Design a protein around this ligand. Structure first.
Ligand SMILES: N#Cc1ccc(O[C@@H]2c3ccccc3C[C@H]2N2CCC[C@@H](N)C2)c(Cl)c1
Ligand SMILES: [Ca+2]
Ligand SMILES: [Ca+2]
Ligand SMILES: [Ca+2]
Ligand SMILES: [Zn+2]
Lengths: 100, 336, 38, 68, 49
C-alpha cells in the first residue's frame, strides 16, 4: 500500500499550492440534468460489473448441491410424468379393448 | 415423527413435487407444519434446497407457518425466484420489511432479531433482491447517534446493551454495503464519502466495535474507488471526481471545482485520490500554465529550480510591476 | 460457469415437461376421436 | 430450566452455522463426480422408461391391429 | 462444560504421550475452537452469560 500512501501525501502537497494564497517566497513576502444521466449510466455499469465479479468467485459445496437438487427434482418430475402418461394411456386402451 | 409426516418431509426436501402435491391434495390429516430433526417444516426444507415448484405449492396453503423465516432464508441464500414467490404471499402485502413473524422455531429466530429482509439482502449484497425490496419501500433505518439520550434508545440500552450494540453494527453493515449504496440514493459517491467518514468517527467512539466500523468505512471507500474505476471518458471522470458541475459554483481561474476532492482528502480515502483517473486531473491543475515542463526529465526540473533561485529577485520584481502578465500568470501556477 | 450449467438443466426441464405434455395431449385427442367413432 | 432452554437454542444455532460453513467449502473432484453419476443414472432410467412405454404401447396397438 | 474438560484431558495426554503429542495437541485445540465458536454465536446478554 506504499504506492497509495505516497500518492496521497503528494496530493495533499499539491492542494497546498492550489489555493491562490501566497506567490512570492519567504524573503519577499515581508514587503507589501447531464449529471443525473451520467450517474445513472455509471450506477448501472457498477451493478453489472459487481455481478460479474460475484460470478468470478469460486464454486462452493452449497452451490453445487443446489445444482444437485435440481437434478434430483427433475428426476421425480420426469419419472412420474411418463408413468402418468402411460397409466392414462393404457386405461384408454383398456376401454378400447372392452369395446372391442 | 410419523410415517406420513416423515414421507412428506422427505418428499419436500428432495424435490419430489408429485408426491408433495398429492399429499397436499389428498391427506386432510397431515399437518403442513410438521418439522424434522432440526425443526424445519416443509417450507423451510423446500426453500433451503431451492425447490421453487414445491415452494409455490406450499405457499398456496393457508395455515403455512414459518413463511417470514422462509423469506429470510431464501434471501440469505440468493434464490431470486423463490424470494419473489415468497414476497407474493399475502403476509407481505404492501410491506413487512420495516413480532415472532421471522421466528424459525418455537424459541428464537434464524438471524439477529433486528435483521429485517432489507438489511439481510444488503448484507449478502444481492443486487436483484435489494432492488426488489427497495422498490417496495424497504429502507434501512439509519441508527441514531451513539450518545443519543432519547427515550427509545434509552429503553434499548436498559433492556439489553449487548443486543442494542449488535443491532447498530448490523444496520451499518447494511448501509455500507455496495448493493444498498448504489441502489438507494441518487448520489452514491456523495453518500459513500459521508458514510465512510461517519463510520470512521464511530470506530474511535466505539472501542468494542472499532474493527467492525473500520471494516465498514473501508467498504465505503472501496465502493467509491470502484465507482471511479469504471469511468471511460473525461465527462464521467469529472462526474465522479468533481460532482454536478452544472450546480457547482466553479473552480478558481478555470479549474474543475475541487470541492469534492478536498472532502475526499479530509476523509482519507487514500485510493480515490491516488487513483490514476484522479491523479490525471490534479496533474493538469498542477502544471496549470506550464505544458512543456511536464514532459521534461527530473534533471531539467532541477536546473529550473536553480535558474529560478538565481533569478528569484527578478521574478519578485515582475510580480510587483506586472501581476496580470504572461509571467504573472505563469508564476501563479501551483507548480511555479 | 456453474450457473451456465444450472441454466442448462433448467431449460432441459422446460423442454422435456412440455414435450411429454404435448405428446399426451395430441395422443389423447386421437383416442378421443377413436372414442367418438366407437 | 432457562439454562437448558438456552443451551438447546445455542446448540441448534451451532449445528446450523456449522453446516453453513461446511457448505462454504470449495467443491472437489469427488463431489462433482457424485453429481455426474446422478446424471448418468437419470439417463438410464429415462431411456429405459420411454422405451418400455412404447413397447407396451405398440404391443397394445398390435393387438388392436389383430382385432381389426 | 464437556469441551473444556476434554480440552484439558487431551492437553494432559499430549505431555504423557510424546509419540502422539501433535495429535493430542491438535484435538485439544479442536475442543477450544468449539467452545470459542459456541460463544461467538451469542446474540444477547442472557446467552452470553
Ligand atoms: N502556496 C503555497 C505554499 C507555500 C509554501 C508551503 O510550504 C512551505 C515550504 C515550501 C518549501 C520548502 C519548505 C517549506 C516549509 C513550508 N512552510 C509553510 C508555512 C508553514 C510552515 N510550517 C511550513 C506550502 Cl505547504 C504552500
Ligand atoms: Ca460461491
Ligand atoms: Ca430448483
Ligand atoms: Ca467439498
Ligand atoms: Zn435514539
Amino acid at each position: 500500500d506504499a504506492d497509495v500512501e505516497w500518492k496521497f501525501a503528494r496530493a495533499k502537497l499539491w492542494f497546498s499550492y492550489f489555493e491562490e494564497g501566497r506567490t512570492l517566497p519567504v524573503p519577499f513576502n515581508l514587503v507589501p440534468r447531464q449529471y443525473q444521466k451520467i450517474m445513472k449510466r455509471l450506477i448501472k455499469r457498477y451493478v453489472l460489473q459487481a455481478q460479474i465479479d460475484k460470478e468470478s468467485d469460486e464454486v462452493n459445496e452449497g452451490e453445487l448441491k443446489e445444482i444437485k437438487q435440481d437434478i434430483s427434482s427433475l428426476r421425480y418430475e420426469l419419472l412420474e410424468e411418463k408413468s402418468q402418461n402411460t397409466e392414462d394411456l393404457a386405461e384408454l386402451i383398456r376401454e378400447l379393448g372392452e369395446k372391442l | 415423527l410419523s410415517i406420513e409426516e416423515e414421507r412428506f418431509l422427505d418428499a419436500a426436501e428432495y424435490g419430489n413435487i408429485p408426491v408433495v402435491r398429492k399429499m397436499l391434495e389428498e391427506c386432510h390429516s397431515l399437518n403442513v407444519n410438521c418439522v424434522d430433526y432440526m425443526g424445519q417444516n416443509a417450507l423451510q426444507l423446500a426453500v433451503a434446497n431451492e425447490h421453487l415448484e414445491i415452494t409455490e405449492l406450499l405457499l398456496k396453503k393457508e395455515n403455512l407457518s414459518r413463511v417470514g423465516d422462509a423469506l429470510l432464508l431464501a434471501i440469505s441464500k440468493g434464490y431470486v425466484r423463490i424470494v419473489e414467490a415468497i414476497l407474493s404471499h399475502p403476509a407481505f402485502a404492501e410491506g413487512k420489511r420495516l413480532d415472532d413473524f421471522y421466528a424459525y422455531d418455537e424459541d428464537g429466530t434464524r438471524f439477529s432479531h433486528d435483521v429485517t429482509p432489507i438489511i439481510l439482502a444488503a448484507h449478502c449484497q444481492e443486487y436483484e433482491i435489494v432492488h426488489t425490496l427497495l422498490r417496495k419501500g424497504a429502507r434501512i433505518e439509519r441508527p441514531h447517534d451513539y450518545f443519543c439520550k432519547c427515550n427509545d434508545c434509552n429503553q434499548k440500552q436498559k433492556h439489553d446493551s449487548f443486543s442494542h450494540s449488535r443491532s447498530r453494527i448490523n444496520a451499518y453493515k447494511g448501509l455500507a454495503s455496495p448493493a444498498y449504496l448504489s441502489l438507494s440514493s441518487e448520489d452514491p459517491v456523495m453518500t459513500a464519502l459521508e458514510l465512510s467518514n461517519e463510520l470512521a468517527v464511530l470506530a474511535n467512539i466505539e472501542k468494542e466495535f472499532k474493527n467492525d466500523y473500520k471494516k465498514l468505512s473501508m467498504q465505503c471507500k472501496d465502493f467509491v474507488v470502484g465507482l471511479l474505476d469504471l469511468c471511460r471518458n473525461t465527462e464521467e471522470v469529472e462526474a465522479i471526481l468533481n460532482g454536478d458541475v452544472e450546480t457547482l459554483q466553479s473552480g478558481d481561474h478555470g479549474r474543475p471545482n475541487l470541492s469534492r476532492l478536498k472532502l475526499a482528502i479530509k476523509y482519507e480515502v487514500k485510493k480515490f485520490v491516488a487513483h490514476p483517473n484522479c491523479q490525471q486531473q490534479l496533474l493538469s491543475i498542477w502544471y496549470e500554465n506550464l505544458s512543456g515542463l511536464r514532459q521534461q526529465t527530473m534533471a531539467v526540473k532541477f536546473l529550473v529550480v536553480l535558474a529560478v533561485a538565481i533569478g528569484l529577485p527578478f521574478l519578485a520584481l515582475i510580480y510587483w510591476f506586472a501581476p496580470c502578465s504572461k509571467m504573472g500568470k505563469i508564476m501563479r501556477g501551483p507548480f511555479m
